[PDB]
């Protein structure tokens, strides 16, 4: 939740999410599920958003309703910030363990630095069980196992609460011994020396000595209990490994190149008609089957005869309409692509007319007779058609 | 005048090291070569905030512009520090510390 | 001196120094020697250290005990800052002329900008002679020769000392003429006009006129003496030329690729056991002969039968132990590399457990039957084994 | 006008302008002409100037004497900032419509960000007609046509002037009703309550209510008149497409590579002698025909037998002299190039001795027997020869 309120042109021109899966839509407490996906970095990265040089993969849940045991992006385990390069594809996976019972919308997201957060597709997950049954077992370097949910909290209380009690006792002792109105009147008449005497200073000195002794004893006992500790581990990770499989954007001799010659979107309609110059550098005829948005999917019903397993609020199984003529290998063709769905309006992609850059962006997928998929990046300026 | 007279009265001790020499392929001053030859471990060349040129620099106005800017700022700094010195000359005796 | 105190993971993961030579270990005064070497920029450059885009090659000596007549990095004479690119190799050379008698530890170093200094291997140099015999001859554009050690100092004194004498005379004159207590008492009684009169103002005006005349005369005489001067020369140099010889990291079809599958280092032991996946893209079987550190060398005694000419405090001629099986061409093999030397502890590379990033980095050299060397970059996280 | 005052080394080492044309040197009012050209980004971009990552193509005229209907750089329509990459060539074109009669010097320029402006060649254009006859027709999205010269100014006056009149009336009313001296004397004697009474507060409240009503009515009427408006469009454009034609710097197997072994320039003479190592990677012998400067052209009279159509103040048709021996294919040759013209002094390229970096830069063009042109980038340090 929250993406609809973000500007359409920034959502479309930053990260193009594609195949995203949720291994389980219903999990028990202490049950693991994997949210995987792929992301493409738009070549024309907006000037408003900072470079993806510093970014962090994250799970968009309403809290620790699922515990992230691990996450991997760019063929690397990624507990800290990573680097995404412009115009490259990266695969990601997140392991999540059920904690809190209920129905929750869990998304894939990437928080880029001072540009900010980019939210991907989400799905409703049902967690059944009791949160009291949740365990988070963690093994240490010495082989000891702890429960990360409950570990170390008793020590925190046993150190923090007694000192608060001591401070309250100090304040209460001085307040009862001297008072506020009486002390004020004594100080106001020049008798400020009557408030504090030698015995009070001696009591303060004894209290300070005891406090220092307690601090030293606590430090020594803590060091004895935990003789070997390490500092917090932080820093940017090594450069990631992009996807280099056949069919993705930026791969070898066989590919598709699409250029946006022009587009019109209705205001406040639900339509978007674009003109695409397509160059087919593969060996087989291709049909356009999908247009990809900020997380939305507009599918060609002639290519996608049966709708796939995707969240309902982002899946337009009939949203894309084109001609029924395949693009022959080595043929450059200009085609007219129509995107028409109520999801274009619900997800506030029709609010493009409110932005300071009236541009679209995303991925186009082309399919062979045998089902091989080729991805191309489309983007560019569009014109609003104002209708009443 | 304090801002304007800084460079003319420093030039007699400065010009001798501003003579030009030709090294392996480059042109150097004697001051740059003195700094290069006698090695300072913690003084790389990139640290020095010296002029490197600008597209808004004009026909030989660098030193006069710097001198006039220094004089103008020195006016305000003098006005502030005169009263700073007046404050530091206080004979006030306080009762409680 | 000073590198031991720097963090191990920053030393290992910034600059990998290799073959470094000192042409002479004993020089006379006015005698030249050349310190040469090569450096590799670690691909996973730490986020803490700034980019090597602005860097300066330097000689780490305790002062101008040797005079740097020239220095070259990246096939360019480098009196100013240069640019080093990540994952590339650069050769450097420095010419040094003996100035001060004594024994000095002279190192290769590179000062990168707001990351800071990186110190390479050092060697003890004995300079014999008298510093009074030192000369620094420099030729000007007009053909005149000067001694850079002694040139221009007499002019500096002759301009600076007389003005200090004039200022002292001014202060002394006013102090003797008026005084401090007498002037204070005169001003305090409202007789401040008695301190300064018309004659005092006339004397001040005459002094100011003489000072202005002296300044103008000095400027004119200085311009007459040196009619042609140039401003200080500063700025970043043109991009450098990296090493492109066979066997270095990032060269053609024949190479070695090493990936760190995992490593363990003892705390506070002197050992480091790592697991290396090695892919051999050369035409001949290779044996691992050396691991390179922040400037340390851990050599395989089976490959390095005779120890080379290297400083003793960085040369572990028996520090590397592996299996005695050569890696056949085109063969991917997982090997276990053991690094064991007291130099690992003395140079405080064992302090990795104090850092916020427990990672190692460096170069691995592989050798053919005919002695051809192939370099690969190794690096990645390691695990501390706490022992008592 | 203004380039002469810029430092020579920054002009030479930032942007190398080549073939630049003005379609018409004399235009009428409402008559269009096209100023086209090409630009090369110097590989050794100065540290003083910021990166060309943010830059804007512009026409250097003394004002809107010509109206820019369109401009294109890097195969893209460019009304906003673009990105230029180091060491690449970009073609630009600007369409200009005559507005003000007179003779004006119109230049090609590129304003890079916090480095600043870089000015290219200029030409004198004669605009004949009356500025009152100028029209700037613009079509809206609804098909309505407006005159951009005159559109919207009447609304600006009709909103701004009446409010200024109202404010003047307010000030005048209070001034006449109360006065300044009388009000001051009343307030000074403790009779400040006599100045302002209940009727004055009521008048102020009525005036404020009327002002608020007028503001609301104006806003509503304005929204009714223009129901559909869009925000200002701003932002960096997508990456540009460099020139990839044969013969430009950075193209395929056939090319020329020139390295500056050394150069001398007279001070204050008009000469510049340089030594060039030339490697010819083409299939035909080449003769050097031109050296390119900050916008100046020094032509070889043996190659350029007839001077081309270029502005007189930048065209040195006899400024370049070399040997008359063609450089055979695949031959590396060291040649001595002499540049001698009064334009080198007039354009203040001889002021190189005033800069903090005594370097030259530019482009060298080589020509085949059939007239094919190959460009190479030359640059590097030069030595001033002081003469009297
Ligand atoms: Cu959601
Ligand atoms: Cu040392
Ligand atoms: Cu002009």
Automatic annotation (TrEMBL), chains A, C, D:
Its domain of life? Bacteria
Which controlled-vocabulary keywords does the entry list? Answer: Metal-binding, Monooxygenase, Oxidoreductase
- Residue numbers binding Cu(2+): 1, 105, 107
Please report the name of this protein according to its UniProt entry.
Methane monooxygenase/ammonia monooxygenase subunit B
Organism this protein belongs to: Hyphomicrobiales bacterium
Task: Provide the taxonomic classification.
Answer: Bacteria, Pseudomonadati, Pseudomonadota, Alphaproteobacteria, Hyphomicrobiales
From TrEMBL, chain B:
Q: Which UniProt keywords apply?
A: Monooxygenase, Oxidoreductase
- Name the domain of life: Bacteria
Listed name of the protein:
Methane monooxygenase/ammonia monooxygenase subunit A
Q: Which organism is it from?
A: Methylocystis sp. B8
What lineage does UniProt assign to this protein's organism? Answer: Bacteria, Pseudomonadati, Pseudomonadota, Alphaproteobacteria, Hyphomicrobiales
